[PDB]
A paper describes a structure:
Methacrylate phosphopeptides derived from 14-3-3-binding proteins irreversibly label 14-3-3σ via either lysine or cysteine residues, depending on the position of the electrophile. Our primary objective was to design binders that would target conserved lysines in the phoshopeptide binding groove of 14-3-3σ: lysines 49 and 122. Methacrylate peptides targeting a conserved lysine residue exhibit pan-isoform binding of 14-3-3 proteins both in lysates and in extracellular media.
Significant covalent labeling of 14-3-3σ with the expected adduct mass was observed for the peptides 3 (51%), 8 (35%), and 11 (57%), all of which were predicted to bind Lys122. We analyzed these peptides further using time course labeling experiments at lower peptide concentrations (5 µM) at 25 °C. Peptides 3 and 8 reached 60% and 80% labeling within 5 h, respectively. Peptide 3 remained unmodified even after 3 days. In contrast, peptides containing or following Lys122 were significantly depleted by peptides 3 and 8, albeit not uniformly, while the signals of Lys49 containing peptides were slightly increased. This result pointed to Lys122 as the likely binding site for peptides 3 and 8. To further confirm that Lysine 122 is the target residue for peptides 3 and 8, we co-crystallized 14-3-3σ with both peptides. The crystal structures clearly showed the covalent bond formed between the amine of Lys122 with the methacrylate, with Lys49 remaining unmodified. Comparison of the crystal structure with the prediction from CovPepDock indicated the model correctly predicts the binding pose around the phosphate and the N-terminal part of the peptide, but less so for the C-terminal region. While peptide 12 labeled only the sigma isoform, peptides 3 and 8 labeled all isoforms with similar efficiencies, Taken together these results conclusively validate that peptides 3 and 8 specifically bind to Lys122 via aza-Michael addition.
Author numbering:
A (entry chain A), C (entry chain A): -4 to 71, 75 to 137, 139 to 231
B (entry chain P), D (entry chain P): 86 to 93
Write the structure that this text describes.
């Protein structure tokens, strides 16, 4: 496509407007449109893509959790199929959005990504979208979990070789990978160890940053520390 | 619940 | 319709679930479905209908205002047609939602409403949805404004004859009608006079209420007083 | 801006 007739620059402009109006679903469609033009994304464009879909999927994940919890409470008086039906409806939409993002990554964002920044970014995204599929999977959960792990590990390998320890995406990758270990893969010890080593290595690299870079790194570092305080 | 990296 | 195959009671149940999950768009579709079954709505059902659409339209109105304001700032460097196009897109969707609600009221909620409670409720809704159309209208603004006024006045006439002055819907009707006068019809004096007389008449009827009724009336009364503090 | 009756 519906965005096939619009200029790439117009889609990017509209995505920024949709962000200001908090129209994340529109923002996502504009950015899908932009990606399907077939040109590589700049840093700012990758960010818009990421914000759009994280907000769309964020809303669906929160609804899903509300509904699963009502559903689980009902399996402790008989209320009919409605709770399960609606939970399945929300779940199905959630899986379609994740399938949309993973399709974009596979056609052809990841294979065209040559620079460490872009490649790490896209592999992290892939990890996160499999992680979201894993949160709702029951019967294939194992293959989904392994696809998440494999994308995260590939991104971690490149980020460790190619980026400084305070790089915000390296940090955000490690944070999300640690949440994977703790909440999805049932490995709280792996989670805690990754969070601690990530925090410590960033700490020792703060001295190299400007005041602005410093502010960006330390924000993600606080979330690592918040999780460590929760997990310990 | 653990916090993941926020949107951005 | 898409809800034509689902049970009325199942649509109502799902609407309540959608509310808990903050899926207002789903909530609205379920309640449209429920209305199209052709049975009159109970008090609780009317409330669900009202919450669903007010939230859907609330989101669109806020986006529209963000975009109009960017558009107006651009008519003080030339940026192309994108801002206007997107503002028009949001506007068009907003007008479709208002057209959906007014269609439901006209087929056949209002004409089947015999009791004062239901009839006031539906006429107020009609006033509010024309008011939302009026907020975005430029070229027909006059007829839209008059359709709003006429629905509000008809509801005010019934509410004054049939309901006590502290009745929450009578109060909420007067509040919304006063906002109409101030923001839409350019009659700040009419607005202030309606708010004051409404507040004063409720004040003198508080003594008749239980503690629970008392709490419901006084919440709306505070908003009247908040507007009076703004307008004076 | 004036406040109208909130959702609800
Ligand atoms: C939150 C996202 C995963 C990221 O790394 O952002 C960098 C600030
Ligand atoms: C907010 C709506 C218009 C109304 O009257 O609610 C009653 C509490
Ligand atoms: Cl949205
Ligand atoms: Cl459903
Ligand atoms: Cl992979
Ligand atoms: Cl919604
Ligand atoms: Cl558009
Ligand atoms: Cl009328
Ligand atoms: Mg029982
Ligand atoms: Mg200039």
């Amino acid at each position: 496509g519906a965005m096939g007739s619009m200029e790439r620059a117009s889609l990017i402009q509209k995505a920024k407007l949709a962000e200001q109006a908090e129209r994340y679903e529109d923002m996502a469609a504009f950015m899908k449109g932009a990606v399907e033009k077939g040109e590589e994304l700049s840093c700012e464009e990758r960010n818009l893509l990421s914000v759009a879909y994280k907000n769309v999927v964020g809303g669906q994940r929160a609804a899903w959790r509300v509904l699963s919890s009502i559903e689980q409470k009902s399996n402790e008086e008989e209320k009919g199929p409605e709770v399960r039906e609606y939970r399945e409806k929300v779940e199905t939409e959630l899986q379609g959005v994740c399938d949309t993002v993973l399709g974009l990554l596979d056609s052809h964002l990841i294979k065209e990504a040559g620079d460490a920044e872009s490649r790490v970014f896209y592999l992290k995204m892939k990890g996160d979208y499999y992680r979201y599929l894993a949160e709702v999977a029951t019967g294939d959960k194992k293959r989904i979990i392994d696809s998440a792990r494999s994308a995260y590990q590939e991104a971690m390998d490149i980020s460790k070789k190619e980026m400084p320890p305070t790089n915000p995406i390296r940090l955000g990758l490690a944070l999300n990978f640690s949440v994977f270990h703790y909440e999805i893969a049932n490995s709280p010890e792996e989670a805690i160890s990754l969070a601690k080593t990530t925090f410590d290595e960033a700490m020792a690299d703060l001295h190299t940053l400007s005041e602005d870079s410093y502010k960006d790194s330390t924000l993600i570092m606080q979330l690592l520390r918040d999780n460590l305080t929760l997990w310990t | 619940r653990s916090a993941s990296c926020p949107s951005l």
